[PDB]
Amino acid sequence: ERGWFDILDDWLKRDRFVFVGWSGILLFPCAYLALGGWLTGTTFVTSWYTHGLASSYLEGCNFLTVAVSTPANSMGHSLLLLWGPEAQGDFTRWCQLGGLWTFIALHGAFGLIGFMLRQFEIARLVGVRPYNAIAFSAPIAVFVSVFLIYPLGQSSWFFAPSFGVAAIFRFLLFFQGFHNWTLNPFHMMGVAGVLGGALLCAIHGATVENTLFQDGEGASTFRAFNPTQAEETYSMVTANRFWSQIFGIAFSNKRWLHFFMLFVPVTGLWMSAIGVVGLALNLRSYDFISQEIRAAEDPEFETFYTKNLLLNEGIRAWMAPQDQPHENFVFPEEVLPRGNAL
Amino acid sequence: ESANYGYKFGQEEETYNIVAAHGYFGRLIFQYASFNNSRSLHFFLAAWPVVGVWFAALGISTMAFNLNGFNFNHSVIDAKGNVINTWADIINRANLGMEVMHERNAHNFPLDLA
Amino acid sequence: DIDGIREPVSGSLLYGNNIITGAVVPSSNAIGLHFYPIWEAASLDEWLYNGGPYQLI
Amino acid sequence: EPNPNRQPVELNRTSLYLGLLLILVLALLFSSYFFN
Amino acid sequence: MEVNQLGLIATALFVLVPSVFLIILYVQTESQQ
């Protein structure tokens, strides 16, 4: 059978400068709209009616302070379709109400699906194992847990991260003050995966570059490599001895080494995603009960754990009225927690 | 069997096909965004995190001399002069809460100068 | 007494800490950047109160 | 009735060392929260 | 300190059961030919 389906299959899988594929039907419109919507909003769209914030180049913000901000807390978890009951088909109101945030978040979610389908699709055509697609499950798990599940656990989209540099910084600080997120062992595992992943990246690249075989005469050693050569370009044997003597242990299996490099950052991102799923419900690792019982009764007992809660209590009281305007928090000066003099 | 037994410590021949990996990754993006030279690929793997962590170390090292992050507190002002808050000002609110609570009994004078 | 204000902070496991809250606590703000080896203290008990171990480590 | 699908299982020494390290480190991490 | 008393056996079984799993597997690998 050479019907229209097979003909179309042929055209979609042409070997062109940018491969398309079936996955491209989903990937390219959703990736393009997500990006264009972020650029559109950070250039032209305000956050005045949802947050009380200027947030675009047009208003005078810079690259660090522009954002596409979340909708107002009164929208709840509304999809905020352009043709939905809130905007009623009006493009201007839709922008003022935060419609671009769901637009970006949802087209982004389907774009990421499209990208992972592309890794599967190209891997099947070229004949390689799909481990690159499997490793990409971690960024998807992070995006989905932070930008979708977390706000769905909370009161509204308002508390999801806003799409901007300084907006994300505020999200980090909100999570310290309200969730004590540095204390969470699922975040701790994510940090170990990210920092150990960076460590592995540097140390593997440095080791290869410093155990090279002399395969040419030039002082620039890059030229002495041919993609089709059969031999290894650096000495695993020398690399293994050096690290055994420097550090005690070393890799000896090159397949295990590169699987391990896949494993460490991927696993860490998955662990952090599980912690955030907890924070969707305020299921925090906020306190150690034993510390609190001792500290309540013994005003001489002090640890870095009790020191940090005092910091979180400052963050909450000092940022909440501005950060949560729909709540109408009025905190008189006399109630604000403050140390001496400051 | 584990695929790791397909590599033998000290064997002369490479254990994977870098032309296949380039052929895959080149099509994921485009051909000239992918490395075909293992030496320059591994140099890049070394350089990116090392250079980045150098700058992080230089951040702490230069903020040690109080050359601090960008300050955009009240940078946006309306026609009358009202402050129009940005996300930078929200960050400032959180920083203030940390400032006033930290070392709560250690300051007697209004400015924390070190 | 990390901040030099006679307000000692507990860092060790035997004095009420777990793995997550425990620390070796920095030396006293009263010492500043002065060098504080064991032999500049009148006793080990002084050295420990003032955070001597942090400098040594 | 000898079932033909049986296979021997292995765990090499390196895998034992890695597995013990994971378990002990995970326990060192989570124990504080178990005690609370 | 008023810790949760179950923490002891929870930590002990967390270490012991999976470590024992690996030790069984390793030792019967060695005893193989």
Partner: peptide
């Protein structure tokens, strides 16, 4: 008991380092 538990686990890890380094599988070239 918590303190004993924490130090015990730490002590096992240090013992693990010793065996992993000095009683490792020797790497063999083939």
């Amino acid at each position: 008991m918590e303190t004993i538990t924490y130090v015990f686990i730490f002590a096992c890890i240090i013992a693990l380092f010793f065996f992993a380094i000095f009683f490792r599988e020797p790497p063999r070239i083939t």
